[PDB]
Design a protein around this ligand. Structure first.
Ligand SMILES: C[C@H](O)CNCc1c(Cl)cccc1Cl
Length: 460
């Protein structure tokens, strides 16, 4: 039984509008409806992992698990195993996997973050799951962000609180937030970003949706515009949206958008919007391909339609040599040449680096770099040729070229990270000086850059 080098992952997000689901929700798991949909010929082929995010979910965990498992069994004839289930208020995440994966999945973590203070703390936030799948770390975030067309800034704040405080993955990666802890990170939910057009244009928007002419609406989608201006979800991907806005429908049909202000909406308009989204971020040069992104047409119990996305995701095997794990493989080394960090910080402290990777026995601290002034005001931290030689646990190129080095630049004064990034070892050549680059972020905001050269020695 060979270990996989690819798996397929289903991501579902559905704001259920505090209503039980209908008797059949199989179209969701089959990626059928509007948008980028799955080929009929694949219907019986199970995904390896199904990750279901709900919001405004009125069901018990037990009730929803029974519906999900019975749904997948009907589609696939496979009895899926429950990896994890976590609920915060009415925000839920379920992870189901094929039974053959039970002994490939380990280090299962769950957490939640509650967003807002006093007034604004009570029902919005995120749940998350992480685990190892063989040698690959996978994280999944289901967030219900602040509602309302005029709260895009609040949503961006909710995003930053969730990525700062959601405690998933390897706690030894202390400088790193969830946006660096995983080979593949999927973030989905009712993100609640709106199509930002005048209220008077509601009927015009509806007309455009009936014509399947989304271009003039997506150009006002607050998530696309905020992402384009690097206000939120920096370094995340989203597939092109080719399905109608998933909010706000009249229940029991999909023929009508209910957008007019009502006491029940706090006298707010709900112009048709793409509230319900799936984004991802994978480490550099790892295979990840979106194979569906759409909405169902036949599930109408909520004022939202379910959204599906599916992915091919590269995975690696749990590598064992004669040497590592449990020693170094002297045949292997990672060297850094001519490296420097460019930082946006206005501070003057000394900086050092930390290198973190599961290819190392433990993280490595550099000596301090030498600060200089950039020509446009910047702080440049020069490491020259002073960075340590990293000793990986396994030298085999089939393992080592699949690995990544996380970098944090830390203040010597405070040991606080000013920036985090990631470097792929999937090089064009070994034993060859090659340029490397990563942007550096902190709390998911751009704080600088790290660039230089790498020289990777494998046992080949
Ligand atoms: C590799 C990714 O495609 C980068 N995405 C950046 C981006 C955003 Cl986030 C929004 C609008 C346009 C663009 Cl290029």
């Amino acid at each position: 039984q060979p270990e996989p080098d690819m798996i397929t992952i289903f991501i579902g997000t559905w704001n259920m509008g505090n209503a039980p689901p209908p008797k059949k929700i199989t179209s969701w798991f089959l990626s059928k409806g509007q948008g980028k949909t799955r080929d009929d010929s694949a219907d019986y082929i199970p995904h390896d992992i199904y990750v279901i995010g709900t919001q405004e979910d009125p069901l018990s965990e037990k009730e929803w698990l029974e519906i999900l498992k019975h749904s997948l069994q009907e589609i696939t004839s496979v009895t899926f195993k429950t990896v994890a289930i976590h609920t915060l208020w009415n925000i839920r995440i379920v992870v189901l996997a094929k039974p053959e994966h039970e002994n490939r999945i380990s280090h299962i973590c769950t957490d939640n973050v509650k967003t807002g203070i006093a007034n604004t703390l009570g029902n919005k936030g995120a749940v998350g799951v992480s685990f190892m799948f063989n040698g690959t770390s996978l994280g999944f975030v289901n967030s219900h962000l602040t509602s309302g067309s005029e709260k895009k800034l609040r949503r961006n704040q909710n995003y930053m609180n969730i990525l700062r405080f959601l405690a998933l993955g390897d706690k030894k990666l202390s400088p790193f937030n969830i946006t660096h802890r995983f080979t593949h990170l999927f973030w989905f939910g009712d993100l609640n970003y709106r199509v930002d057009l005048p209220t008077w244009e509601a009927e015009t928007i509806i007309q455009k949706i009936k014509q399947q002419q989304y271009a003039d609406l997506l150009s006002h989608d607050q998530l696309l515009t905020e992402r384009r201006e690097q206000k939120v979800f920096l370094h995340f991907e989203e597939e092109e949206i080719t399905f109608a806005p998933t909010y706000r429908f009249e229940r029991l049909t999909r023929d009508k958008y209910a957008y007019t202000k009502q006491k029940a909406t706090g006298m707010k308009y709900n112009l048709p919007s793409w509230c319900d989204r799936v984004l991802w971020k994978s480490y550099p040069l790892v295979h990840v391909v979106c194979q569906s992104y759409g909405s169902t047409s036949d599930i109408m119990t909520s004022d939202h339609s379910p959204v599906f996305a599916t992915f091919e995701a590269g995975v690696t095997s749990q590598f064992v040599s004669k040497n590592g794990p449990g020693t170094v493989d002297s045949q292997g080394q990672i060297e850094f040449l001519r490296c420097y960090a460019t930082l946006k910080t206005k501070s003057q402290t000394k900086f050092y680096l930390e290198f973190h990777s599961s290819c190392l026995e433990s993280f490595v601290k550099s000596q301090e770099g030498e600060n200089e002034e950039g020509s446009e005001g910047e702080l440049v931290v020069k490491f020259g040729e002073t960075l340590p030689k990293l000793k990986p646990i396994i030298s085999d190129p089939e393992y080592l070229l699949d690995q990544h080095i996380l970098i944090s630049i830390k203040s010597s004064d405070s040991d606080e990270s000013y920036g985090e990034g990631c470097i792929a070892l999937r090089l064009e050549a070994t034993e060859t000086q090659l340029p490397i680059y990563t942007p550096l972020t902190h709390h998911g905001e751009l704080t600088g850059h790290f660039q230089g050269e790498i020289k990777l020695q494998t046992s080949q």
